[PDB]
Ligand binder design. Structure first.
Ligand SMILES: [Mn+2]
Ligand SMILES: [Mn+2]
Ligand SMILES: [Mn+2]
Ligand SMILES: [Mn+2]
Lengths: 198, 198, 198, 198
């Protein structure tokens, strides 16, 4: 039974980069909805499966991908942010960043590019390619989860749906991106990165 | 040279159904951006074409579909609304509505369904099937235009991107839908509908 | 636990419209393969679902739709064909055809057009729109099944994947489409049709 | 105005890895067809663009990408093959292979895997990531070209559409992939490779 994870901080802990109103609606409304819908969809799939109803299984994929993906994306996104966030990582993550992207600064510009590049709803990601053994940036549409659809392990995700910023930054997505860098929780991103090492 | 069409009314003419802030940002920012980008993209395509650069032509499709589609969608959307809007059409359109959807009320619920059904950004449409000679509802993702991607002629479009309602209705899209019915300009929809008759 | 259905006739029963080599390969190799792959995929989804592993469920979707859809489509396909087949349908189904598409030949041209129109691999279909309560033609990419992806009820399907005709017709898909009309099993198409109204 | 390029060798030059019947059909029928359809599509887009008809431009995109891509892919394909071909590449390209994929055999398994993995019609590719400055493998659906859709530079392409192997290998795509390694023209792949660094 999937459940809505508690935010690691208060709804206003990211001010002024991401105001409390956005944070509150994001946890309590958008993420809450998809968890419940994910559960409803899963139950349905369990029944369709048991009866060998392939057609039902297919018709249910969009809702499962969207609600399941949404739950995955927000669970990770919350952890990716912090009131102590900002700055740059150190050690291996930072070393990998320069290695695969030239410099941390170039990296920000690239991930910022993929994120602003999303036409419509979506997410920009810094993920790890286990097969290639290196970092990689990818953009995913709507709620399609990174690992489930590309195989890359999610490290840093920048939610770019308009409910992630419109109330505060309106149609100017670049300002949202520039701002979010101030709250990135690199300790978590580093943790995730190291979990790929082992 | 494509240009930003003037709204048929003032930015606050749709209050309280669609507030002036949304209207202003929608005309002046979202629609304005895509017209300019559409022009830039077209120029590029003219050059790619002239040189027989097929790869360039392909790489340019997303921007052309999105910006071109966006311009088409908003040009129509503005005309689809009015301060006198609301109610129901009469004559042939209304007759076709009952004919193809049972009743006007059933129709609203169906178009409302496709519109709320959009997972991510998109549009809900009431269009005309020239080949079948009847009305039809369709949902299109992001800025993909109705006629250009389905062949159906656009009659009524309900923009469902979050910039069409988030500031006022937040994450509750149904309230936005329920509200928009009050400003639908049926005279225009009827006009468009009749242009399919001839 | 899904199984490969025996054909309703001899492998060379559809000669000379579809030769025995094709029929045999198509049944014993192509359909058999998706049957097995489906059973494998479903088993995996069963474990994923039981573990609450949403990522895995998402990753399995392409295979489930492809193999699951492959199984649905080919099963229907075999029943839509007959060595005694051909000609035209009669009664209600035939009435619907005249009404929905004008005439049998107009319907034929439309189904043929949709089938020849498939770019890459796919299927052309004659379906039933329960909502609108009428006939509707559609094309599906790869093995995406009609109902699971469009909500339409499959009545008649035409496989336009190259393995469905290449050995006998090579690149000339049109020659294949013309020939297949001779072995259509309207008795079966009719059954599926009458089962829609109930 | 696009034209069909003569093959660099005799239709039966790749025997017995790819037989003469396939080569001839593939060149004179399949590639020829996309060449013509491309010229037709481009001419239409030329008129659409000149008239500012965005809807028409949008409608033409699927055909432009399919035919345009078809032309790009097959042109590259012919040069990637040689009757004297086979073996392994040497020097930088070979060095990159060992580095990017471990070894030649690891690279082979990966390209083969991507090619066999294509569900429906498509191509497996060995490309060059100019941004990351390294080799990268990818698969493209139908005729979607490598660069125009992924930004990667095509070095080696493997057509896994059924018309590329069915007459000779039937459903056994793996047998096709193994055989094709014998006629790869590394001299050409190398040229494309060295042209990337410049
Ligand atoms: Mn979100
Ligand atoms: Mn809009
Ligand atoms: Mn088949
Ligand atoms: Mn080919």
């Amino acid at each position: 039974k999937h459940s809505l994870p508690d935010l690691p901080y208060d709804y206003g802990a990211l001010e002024p980069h991401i105001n409390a109103q956005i944070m509150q609606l994001h946890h309590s409304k958008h993420h809450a909805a998809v968890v419940n819908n994910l559960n409803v969809t899963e139950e349905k799939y369990q029944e369709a499966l048991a009866k060998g109803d392939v057609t039902a299984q297919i018709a249910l994929q969009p809702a499962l991908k969207f609600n399941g993906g949404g739950h995955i994306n927000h669970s990770i996104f919350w952890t990716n942010l912090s009131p102590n966030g900002g700055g740059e990582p150190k050690g291996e993550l930072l070393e990998a960043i320069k290695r695969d992207f030239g410099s941390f600064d170039k990296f920000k510009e690239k991930l910022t590019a993929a994120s602003v590049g999303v036409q419509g709803s979506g997410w920009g990601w810094l993920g790890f390619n286990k097969e290639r053994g290196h970092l990689q940036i990818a953009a995913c549409p709507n709620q399609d989860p990174l690992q489930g659809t590309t195989g890359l392990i999610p490290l840093l995700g920048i939610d770019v749906w308009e409910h992630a910023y419109y109330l505060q930054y309106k149609n100017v997505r670049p300002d949202y991106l520039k701002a979010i860098w101030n709250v990135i929780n690199w300790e978590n991103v580093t943790e995730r990165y190291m979990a790929c090492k082992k």
